[PDB]
């Protein structure tokens, strides 16, 4: 938790529904965005901060929280925009003799700024007398182990916490959700949506010889006349659905 791993995610499609319905996540607290809407949004960057935290301190991974974790190990900003996922991994981070590989910072001069990693192991001086790198009276090692065991309490078991931080800017949008595939319908008046371009018309097979770099074709008056299906690289002519004055 004091050395939480941060991974930057970009240039890919993120299927948040698949991860949502993947395992038994004891906590899926999304602040600033509903989870079900995660597939309908494009994010500039996705930061995956992964660490291990005991059960009682899981609640401390949230904006506006106070405590040893939220002040010395991992601080979430008050303007946090993203999800926090946590699942009880008692079958992987708990050992009979005690798993001491996970350490949490216990003593620090000041509370951590949001999204700050401090992996300094210098002895903390709690008294007037200097420590000079030697731990003793009024001199404490900042990091303390957890010591997870399978027989520990439910609130003392290790939870593997992954905090997804979406950089909600949408200008250099590179992480998006999955893409819908509604079956193409031809020779019928339909409301088509190709690559975000919306319109209404009748789609027919076309003999136009598109060049490979070209996506759609316009008329003399710059009205969309043909498109290319992003799924199947084929060219479809778009004709307006028939209209005309009704005279009696």
């Amino acid at each position, epitope marked *: 938790v004091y050395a939480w791993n941060r991974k930057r995610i970009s240039n890919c499609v993120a299927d948040y529904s698949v991860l949502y319905n993947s395992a038994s996540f004891s906590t899926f607290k999304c602040y600033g965005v509903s989870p079900t809407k995660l597939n309908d949004l494009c994010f500039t960057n996705v930061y995956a901060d992964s660490f291990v935290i005991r059960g009682d301190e899981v609640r401390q991974i949230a904006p506006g929280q106070t405590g040893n974790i939220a002040d010395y190990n991992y601080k979430l900003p008050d303007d946090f925009t993203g999800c926090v996922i946590a699942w009880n991994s008692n079958n992987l981070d708990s050992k009979v003799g*005690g798993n001491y590989n996970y350490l949490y910072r216990l003593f620090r001069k000041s509370n951590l700024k949001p999204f700050e990693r401090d992996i300094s192991t210098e002895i903390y001086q709690a008294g007037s007398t200097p420590c000079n790198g030697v731990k003793g009276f009024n001199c404490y090692f900042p990091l303390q*182990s957890y010591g997870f065991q399978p027989t520990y309490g439910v609130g003392y078991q290790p939870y593997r916490v992954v905090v997804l931080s979406f950089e909600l800017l949408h200008a250099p949008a590179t992480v998006c959700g999955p893409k819908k595939s509604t079956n193409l319908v031809k020779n019928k008046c339909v409301n088509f949506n190709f690559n975000g371009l919306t319109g209404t018309g009748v789609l027919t097979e076309s003999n136009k010889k598109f060049l490979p770099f070209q996506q759609f074709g316009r008329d003399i008056a710059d009205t969309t006349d043909a498109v290319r299906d992003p799924q199947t690289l084929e060219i479809l002519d778009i004709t307006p659905c028939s209209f005309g004055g009704v005279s009696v």
Partner: antibody, heavy 118, light 108 residues
Framework: QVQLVESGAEVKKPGSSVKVSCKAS????????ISWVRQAPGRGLEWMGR????????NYAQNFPGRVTITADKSTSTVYMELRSLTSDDTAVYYC???????????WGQGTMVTVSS | AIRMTQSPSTLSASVGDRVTITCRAS??????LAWYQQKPGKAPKLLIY???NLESGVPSRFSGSGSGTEFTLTISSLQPDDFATYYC??????????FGQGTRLEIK
């Protein structure tokens, strides 16, 4: 480059006790746990106990109830493993291993040959 | 106490061949398993950790696989320097840690 240096060879009699050392040189002693592994001649490795500097705790193997008492001096980064009630079946090389980073014994000591006989 | 069983206990092979060593556990130890190599008169050195990774400095010819209860150490191209006794650790329970029975590799 972490190097572990143990004590010299020890010759004892049955019914006595032995206490070997493991000087941890380099790195941070307060994070990595030192584990003692013994190997009788003609037999595979056997685990004895673990010292946990971060928690200031010592663990012993289930097959050795009260026979092993592990202490260490954090000032000098030296780990001492005490074995009690030596018998003829305890003649083995008592390595000390540093289970660092990924809980695996990446660094092994030179090993001391402890012989128990009349 | 988790018991570790190796197979074959004694194996012989020539230089450049393929060697497969199976160390099967008694309980589900996930992926926490380490492979060692103990040349006679020398302390064992780590080769594989987490049952799939390769320790720094170990030649790339060593490869490990398997998870759950059965694990496997495989050498792509056996070398004369790779003739020693290989053990498997089970660092999933620290009370007590059980090594393998020892797989001695001999020149055929």
């Amino acid at each position: 480059q972490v190097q572990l240096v143990e004590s010299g060879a020890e010759v004892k009699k049955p019914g006595s006790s032995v206490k070997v050392s493991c000087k941890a040189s380099g790195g941070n002693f307060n994070m990595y746990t030192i584990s003692w592994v013994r190997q009788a001649p003609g037999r595979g490795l056997e685990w004895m106990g673990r010292f946990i500097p971060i928690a200031n705790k010592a663990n012993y193997a289930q097959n050795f109830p009260g026979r092993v008492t592990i202490t260490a001096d954090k000032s000098t980064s030296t780990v001492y493993m005490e074995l009690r009630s030596l018998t003829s079946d305890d003649t083995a090389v008592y390595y000390c291993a540093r289970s660092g980073s990924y809980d695996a014994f990446d660094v092994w000591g030179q090993g001391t040959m402890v012989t128990v006989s009349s | 106490a988790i018991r570790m069983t190796q197979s074959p206990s004694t194996l012989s092979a020539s230089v450049g061949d393929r060697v497969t060593i199976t160390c099967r556990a008694s309980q589900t130890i996930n992926s926490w398993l380490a492979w060692y190599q103990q040349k006679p008169g020398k302390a064992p050195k780590l080769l594989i950790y987490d049952a799939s990774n390769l320790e720094s400095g170990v030649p790339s010819r060593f490869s490990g696989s398997g998870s759950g209860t059965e694990f496997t150490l495989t050498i792509s191209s056996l070398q004369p320097d790779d003739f020693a006794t290989y053990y498997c650790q089970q660092y999933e329970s620290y009370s007590p840690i059980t090594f393998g029975q020892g797989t001695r590799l001999e020149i055929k």
